[PDB]
Amino acid sequence: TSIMAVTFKDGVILGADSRTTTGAYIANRVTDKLTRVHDKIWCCRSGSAADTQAIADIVQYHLELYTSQYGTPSTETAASVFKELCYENKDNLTAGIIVAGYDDKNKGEVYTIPLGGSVHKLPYAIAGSGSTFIYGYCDKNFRENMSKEETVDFIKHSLSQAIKWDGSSGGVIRMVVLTAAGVERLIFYPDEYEQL
Amino acid sequence: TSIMAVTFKDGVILGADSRTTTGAYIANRVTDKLTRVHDKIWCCRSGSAADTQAIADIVQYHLELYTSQYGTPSTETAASVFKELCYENKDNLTAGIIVAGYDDKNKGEVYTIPLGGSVHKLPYAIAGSGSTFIYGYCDKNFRENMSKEETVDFIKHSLSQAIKWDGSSGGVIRMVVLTAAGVERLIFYPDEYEQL
Amino acid sequence: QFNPYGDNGGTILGIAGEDFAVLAGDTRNITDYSINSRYEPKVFDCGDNIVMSANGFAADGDALVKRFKNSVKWYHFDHNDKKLSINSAARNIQHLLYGKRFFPYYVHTIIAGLDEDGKGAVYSFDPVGSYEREQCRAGGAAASLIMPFLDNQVNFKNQYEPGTNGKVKKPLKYLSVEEVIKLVRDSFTSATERHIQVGDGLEILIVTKDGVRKEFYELKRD
């Protein structure tokens, strides 16, 4: 798995590959790892698929019930609910989640929640097995307040390399753009990104 | 450990960090991992320090005895002697060696010899614990037939990132330039490379 | 795997005199080959003219002493400020220790004071609460070094009257407080030389009818 969330001028973009493996067999080559917990709060899932789905489903439930009572939750609030589940059940979970969301007040925010259940607010985040291969690349090439087109290229180039070196990563590059304008889904196929 | 060898127009450059760790303690912060088996055939060592030193010492002995009888050995010949030791004693060794050398006929050549004892001739090679973090960076930024100054920058930037992310890597960046002109040693300190 | 126990080293020593008692302990606290503190008090005044030390795993030792101090406080509330006698304190400590029989307190406990006739008393406990009244007891890391010496010097073991062939033992005597403190100091100086976990300082608490007095002596810091 290669997943990342990147803040930029207009908001935030989440990116992911589409490969799910059982050992060396690819169980699903068109997986959707970008998952919606609220209108403009999404997350990228890594680790146990069962665990991250079970968590994400519970968070979606909590934020739906939050919205009914208190109105739209902040991205920080969503990250806190993810954290609370991950931290309190750390002995029984293998979940590495990146939370990304768009407020109008706070604009684009990214929170990463690694195995322990700690929270870390960051300008951008990378995670999953394929992320190890792009720490160098992402650190050198990330800038703050990029445009939409620059951020799409940054994610596309980054995950292209993650896919290239990681056997556990592959397939299509899915992306989800979160701005004031709304929610845009993007897809990029092997024939496009491999030749970069 | 972060080590690499890169071929370029005039020849080849070997690069390495200077950190040796026993767990989390840094046993030596100024290690020299670039080691000479012949005048213009050098190697970068990774894995067990005892094993790679013991191998390198034996190779230096073999190539010295080769030179006495048959004249200057090729870089391919040096790589073969490294391979023969690594492959035949694979059950008792933890050695990951990059061999780099300059002929006038063949120019710059790089051979990598990972744990198994296989040989792979490559335009450039990276190895050691810190190499995982720069696969993405090195693949995107490497070009064939670079100049000396470009290749020094490529290695300096690469190992700077490897050092930044890998705790097992650090200290000074040592380099050894192998051309027709001779053998040049370069050193680069933290205050230079960290701010890149 | 998580290991709930540790070893903070140290050594303690209780000696019962005729109308007094001493409880001494070194002030060094360690883990593995590191010194945590050179002065971390290990022997505590618990009230009612009772002194206590629980040497071994310092977290369990602190917990036990804390619980016993509280046990003294509640004994006063529940029984009209009655003085907790040393024998009653000892039985109470057995129950504290045995309550954790299947997850023990990793400590060797010694208490010192005066019995109800005014005579000096020392009591000693294993980790799960087996106890015995004794005239002499060393506990902790260097207990093996110190106890044979005390057998020889406090209880006069293996010592015979010269010229009697070997048929009249040296007769048992109570030692003066000055003599006991000399034997305590020499025990810890000796233990410091040969045990790496013993050193830094020696704090002695002396219990008489007049109260609890303290004395402190430097020990070698290597």
Add this chain to the structure above:
Amino acid sequence: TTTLAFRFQGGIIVAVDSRATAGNWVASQTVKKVIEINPFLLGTMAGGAADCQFWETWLGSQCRLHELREKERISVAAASKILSNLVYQYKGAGLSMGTMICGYTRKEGPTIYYVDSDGTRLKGDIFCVGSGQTFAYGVLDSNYKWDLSVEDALYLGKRSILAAAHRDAYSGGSVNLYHVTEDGWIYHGNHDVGELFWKVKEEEGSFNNVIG
């Protein structure tokens, strides 16, 4: 640890050693391995020092509550069974006890019950318990008869513990003697092995294996 109790014409003899160890470290030579439950009841202790001392002291409290409630002295059978039923509840948890409950009552006569931490409860005339039991059995079985004098029976119990104190590394210190009769138990002193051994050697002409 060597403890023993045997029945004879003149009642019950109970003898124990006085040593406690943590492995090969001799922790004490002055330990009490006999608990005086009441004037007609005795308990012997072998196995874990804490386990025996705690639960046999507790047994004494349960025996006291019995005589308050029933206005009658607890039987040896009933006292032993309170302890055996208790340890049985803890079975598998790792309690370590080998014990004998010895006493006289009018209805039973002199009675000995062996109780242990794996739940065994046995009535019998002779028992030896502990690491030194085999050594004590050797001396005891050979010179045992039903009709010893109280003086001879006290000596045999003392001598059997001495035998074990000598051979068993984990037994020693001193011998504590008891005699149980119709009228109750009677203490017959603490005998240091370091003095007793030489005394017995000279008077009896035994222990010829030793340089004396």
Add this chain to the structure above:
Amino acid sequence: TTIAGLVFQDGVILGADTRATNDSVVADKSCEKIHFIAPKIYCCGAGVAADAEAVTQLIGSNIELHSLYTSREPRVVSALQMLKQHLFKYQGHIGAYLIVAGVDPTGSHLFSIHAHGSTDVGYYLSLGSGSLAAMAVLESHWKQDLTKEEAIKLASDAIQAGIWNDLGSGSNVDVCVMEIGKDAEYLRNYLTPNVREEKQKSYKFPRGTTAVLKESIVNICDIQEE
């Protein structure tokens, strides 16, 4: 154990504490951890004491025979190469950790050797359970072109750091100074900061205190003769 070595202007210096242990008990309060290899090559030993002693003695013996054979002063690199190849052969089972230093015709040298046969080159080094205490001092105070007087001070300070703060290390400080063009000076008990204080009492017994069963004269001589 706290052993250390560092270089100065025209030489190299080794330092070592004097405590030998068996788990938590102190077996020896004055042992020599600075081993002799050649007249001007010395070896600080840590790890298994028998191993460090045996491996230095063996290489020292072979260095002496090599020196006789070649009619040359032995080199530190020869001791280094021989030690590491021996230790490598045994795969760490000879648990010796060594700091080798000396002077020869090539100059002054300072190396460390680990039990598995790896070697390091350094300007200041430390090994044993007190290495971190010593290295802290060496990292704080070491500089280029130290005088001999500064070097002895720094070395002994590095060893002292281990003595006070490490339980494995203790007692006295041994030093060996190897300077170019001069005899190596070996300074056993260079510092003595841990003398035992005078005892409170004398435990000398009255004569006849111990009970005795038999007495006899032992014949230790050869042949009682007519």
Add this chain to the structure above:
Amino acid sequence: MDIILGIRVQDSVILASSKAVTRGISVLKDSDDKTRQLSPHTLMSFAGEAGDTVQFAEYIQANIQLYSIREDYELSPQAVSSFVRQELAKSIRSRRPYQVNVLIGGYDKKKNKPELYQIDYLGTKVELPYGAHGYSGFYTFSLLDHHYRPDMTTEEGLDLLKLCVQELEKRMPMDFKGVIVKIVDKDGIRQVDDF
């Protein structure tokens, strides 16, 4: 093999050795002689792991018999016991050690003295007035400590041995099927056929 006892009296050494041979579930034999005559005045009883016991005993027997023919002379019990000890002490650091414990009872014709040696499988030798191997000693040593005297006759030694066997028959869990008893004195080795 289970119980082997030895007792040295005034003018002889008496060895008692159990008759049972048990392989797991069943008692295969109840008349087994766990002893070999090494020389006319030296007897060795043995107990330990199956196979190893007899193999070791017979190997020692052959070596002592070879010595006797070569020198036309009987080795002293002390010399035989030292030879046996060294073979066991050599054995313990082998690829597969002999798991055999022995008692060597002999009459030294030079010194006119009985001698009993106890040697375990490690090569731990001791000269004793009385000895045993395995669990036997736990019961029997306390008896022998009480009743033994150095000036006892052979008949007194046999009565003291009956008391040892009775105690073993009372308190040991295994049925060892009684003992074969053999006496070693100035006249040689003989078996007490009724015990």
Add this chain to the structure above:
Amino acid sequence: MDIILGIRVQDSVILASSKAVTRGISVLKDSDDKTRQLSPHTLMSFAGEAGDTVQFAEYIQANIQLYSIREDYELSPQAVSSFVRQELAKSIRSRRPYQVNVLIGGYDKKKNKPELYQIDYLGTKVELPYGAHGYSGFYTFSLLDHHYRPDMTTEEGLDLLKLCVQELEKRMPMDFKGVIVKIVDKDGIRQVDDF
């Protein structure tokens, strides 16, 4: 506990049970009765883990005695054995199972027939003409297969039982210190004091 045997003859059931109680090294007792009377015409012998055996036996005894008082009626041997089986079958899936094997010998006063039930610690019940638990059956069943007839007298049953005990005393390694024998018939339960 070691050996427990049972044999059902014409008009009675005979239970034989060993007297030894061994704790590891020593035989602590040689007169132990490994049986409880459950009702006047029903006897249960037992063997297994220390403590559990007696605790279980006495627990069953109390329950059957409680039934007898409540209904003023003796349960049939079949009914008692079914009760016992269920208690063991419940036990085997507990936190800590009873490690106890039993034989239940009873005389059914309604049918005028002796009945022998063999139940192991798992709750495996079988009605048999003769039964045993543990290693006893390995030796004794082949004898009983040969010599048993359903119409045997009680005296013939006891002679056949002596032949079983003699075989056990010959071929078993452990000294079980003989057996206490008890007969269950129309007149109730009695102990054969000389065996």
Add this chain to the structure above:
Amino acid sequence: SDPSSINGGIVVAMTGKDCVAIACDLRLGSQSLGVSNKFEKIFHYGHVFLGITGLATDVTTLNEMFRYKTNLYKLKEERAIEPETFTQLVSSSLYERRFGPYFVGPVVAGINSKSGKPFIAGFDLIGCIDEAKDFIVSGTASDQLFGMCESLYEPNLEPEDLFETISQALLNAADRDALSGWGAVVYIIKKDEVVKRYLKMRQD
């Protein structure tokens, strides 16, 4: 299982004014079972004394080995071996079994016949030498002996005083160890006389 504590026993050695003392207990056991009360652990080769604690088969084997080696030494050298030289011989012989060692704790004691200097030394099971001015301890009650020696000892004791000090160090240490005791022997060694004394101690 731990070979150094199957049989049990102890040795202690001390220096005095123009003298040395070496002493040992007499117990040999099989763990809890006491077997022999006559198992001496001190041997001598000329005027050099060697005490050995640990696994009893190795105690016996090493005695026989050092008797062998010192006998040959004497035939070739035409003089008795000295304590300093013998110490090196013990160390050599132990270390040659580095990876299959003898499970022993040897102690050398003696007076150099030429210089008159008192000498003691101790070793681990693989031959590391501890040469002490004051005292050496060895065996299952080594911790107990360290405690006794460290408090009781003072330098330059006369032979008859040193006897009392070493005896009390041994006896009180042995009484705190289950696997030591059952009798004791003390050798007082002077330049040309050696007195051997058997001590009366508790037999449990």
Add this chain to the structure above:
Amino acid sequence: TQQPIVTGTSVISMKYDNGVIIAADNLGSYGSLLRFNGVERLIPVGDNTVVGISGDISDMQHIERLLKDLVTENAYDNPLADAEEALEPSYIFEYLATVMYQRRSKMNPLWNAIIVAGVQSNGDQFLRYVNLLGVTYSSPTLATGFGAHMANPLLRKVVDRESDIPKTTVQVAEEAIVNAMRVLYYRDARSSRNFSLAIIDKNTGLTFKKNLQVENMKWDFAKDIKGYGTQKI
């Protein structure tokens, strides 16, 4: 029972004449990966206490929230919350020490080593340690992890015993702490150059210094070191 995942390394500290100094680097390691470079591990509680935490960062964040919640709770029905009934270092420590020991006793520890540094109401210096086992101790210098092995020896040369505390100024103490942090950066493979330092003084109060860097680093000698023994080039 768990294992620590994202971790923080050494926290070092010492007493000086008028107060206490405490310091810790800004790194959150993920094994050998130097994952998070902006992690604050010194957490102030009021204006008189700083709690320095090493070990598991998720458990640190939990403790951080407990302390934040403690300040809130103390303010409830407390008119003297910012005066005589304000939280003391000793109160904050004893709370944490209770929690740490309780958690180890349920076999579910907070996988940390904690140093509570502060100044009491009466001007007394407070400095005490507690860890995942509930083990507690006080000393003129205290350090966790690698700091125990490397910082303490250096800091103890300044304050070797209690009587050295009045003789040690804030400049000397801060110099010693900053040097110790450099030594740890040379030698600890799971440390970073960037750190935070806090001084709690009885006169000048709480001074919290962020974004400090290890400086004056000696690397120049490295150029001359060649090979691992015999190599000359």
